[PDB]
Structure formats: structure tokens, C-alpha cells
């Protein structure tokens, strides 16, 4: 199969507050699971200068302190998220995401400008590497049973859909990755700390990105919820 696009419109959404938006996700492939009948399906904010927060998933299960102006709805490959009164402090980029099949995928996003009228991933700071050099990034969780989890990477450049690195298995520290990253990333954990590692390899101004690490579970938590701080990488 090849990889599930998600096409989001519209690309951006100018609005006053007391406004109400919505703003569509498509996919290339269902992501209704004939199995259980459930959308493999989330919607992720990322506010200004903040990483991104987990508001819906399974198309339409909103995380628990979501505020209720938040509705996502649809099936198969149409899928919907409504704010029926949106206030200054929805301006964000507003990303569908598919965790149906790997590798994961996010859509372009949609953003949202606004005119008046206990879970922590604790990352590494900010690194300039030169090019053909390597560099480990640390993400150390608290506020939750360490093994119980995977830690996924996402990389994120100015202008562009999110793209999914991989994940690894924080019980059997054993990872999957994405196609295009393969060579380029390698995940470790360490139990006894709580920490996740990604080592980035002969790296280049391609490279050059945000990484956030990102904590997803099993079966209500499958899809990706709590997001590390993120992890600024410059090669020169």
C-alpha cells in the first residue's frame, strides 16, 4: 500500500472570535477499521511558539479537559473538526493525523487566525551540528508508568505536514520506523530513567528541523497524546 495522504482545506481560516469554523480532513485510504468499526483518526492543535496538544481522537473522542466547542465527526476518509465559537486562544495549526496504518501520517493542516473583532516529555536542548556529524536527542517522561508506552519522534520544519520518524516499544525497546527515516534515525530507551533517545546520523541542512518526542499507548490511548517540548537541530 502506498502512504496515506491527508489532504486538509482550507489552508488557512481568517475568523473573528464568536465565530464558528469548520475545517475538513480528507484521506486517501478508509481509515474505518471493519474490525472494530472505529476511526484511526486525531486532530492535534499546535498554538504559536508551543508544541502541538492531542484534542480528539477516534474521529470524534475528545481528550478529557478538551473544551466542549471542540466536535470532530466523520467516517471512512471525510472527516470534520468544529470550534463552534472560537475564542483568541484557538490560533493554532490545527493537524488531522491517521494512525491506521504505517507509517503514520498528519495532513498539511489547516490554520486558524483570529482577530477580536501530570504527563511531562522533558527533551535536550537546542543543537548546531556540523554536516556529516551525528547528534542524540534525550526525552525523559514523568507522571506515568514509563513502560506501559511507546515514544514516537515527529519531525517539523517551518511550513510543512509533520512527518512521523517512528516509534519504539518502551517495554521491549523495539522500533519501527518510517520508510524515509530508517537510515537516519535510531531509538533506544532507558528503563531506569525514563528516558527515550533518538540518534540522528551523517546529517545534513535537510535535517535541519524541530523534533518533538511523543507519547502514545494501547487500545483507548493508541493514538499519540502528550508531546515533549520539542528539540531544535541547525546543521552548519
Known amino acids: 500500500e502506498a502512504d496515506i495522504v491527508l489532504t486538509q482545506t482550507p489552508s488557512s481560516l481568517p475568523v473573528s472570535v464568536g465565530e464558528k469554523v469548520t475545517m475538513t480532513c480528507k484521506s486517501s485510504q478508509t481509515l474505518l477499521y471493519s474490525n472494530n468499526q472505529k476511526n484511526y483518526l486525531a486532530w492535534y492543535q499546535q498554538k504559536p511558539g508551543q508544541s502541538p496538544k492531542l484534542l480528539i481522537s477516534?474521529?470524534?473522542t475528545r481528550k478529557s479537559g478538551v473544551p466542549d466547542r471542540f466536535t470532530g465527526s466523520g467516517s471512512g476518509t471525510d472527516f470534520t473538526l468544529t470550534i463552534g465559537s472560537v475564542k483568541a486562544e484557538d490560533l493554532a495549526v490545527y493537524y488531522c493525523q491517521q494512525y491506521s496504518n504505517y507509517p503514520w501520517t498528519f495532513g498539511g493542516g489547516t490554520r486558524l487566525e483570529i482577530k477580536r473583532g501530570e504527563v511531562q516529555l522533558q527533551q535536550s536542548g537546542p543543537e548546531v551540528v556540523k554536516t556529516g556529524a551525528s547528534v542524540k536527542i534525550s526525552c525523559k517522561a514523568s507522571g506515568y508508568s514509563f513502560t506501559g508506552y511507546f515514544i514516537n519522534w515527529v519531525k517539523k520544519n517551518s511550513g510543512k505536514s509533520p512527518e512521523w520518524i517512528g516509534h519504539?516499544?518502551?517495554?521491549?525497546?523495539?522500533?519501527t520506523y518510517n520508510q524515509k527515516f530508517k537510515n537516519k534515525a535510531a531509538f533506544t530507551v532507558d528503563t531506569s530513567s525514563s528516558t527515550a533517545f533518538m540518534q540522528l546520523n551523517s546529517l545534513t541542512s535537510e535535517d535541519s528541523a524541530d523534533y518533538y518526542c511523543?507519547?502514545?499507548?494501547?487500545?483507548?490511548?493508541?493514538?499519540?497524546?502528550?508531546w515533549g517540548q520539542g528539540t531544535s537541530v541547525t546543521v552548519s
Open positions: 519504539i516499544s518502551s517495554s521491549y525497546a523495539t522500533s
Open positions: 477516534w474521529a470524534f
Open positions: 511523543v507519547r502514545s499507548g494501547n487500545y483507548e490511548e493508541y493514538a499519540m497524546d502528550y
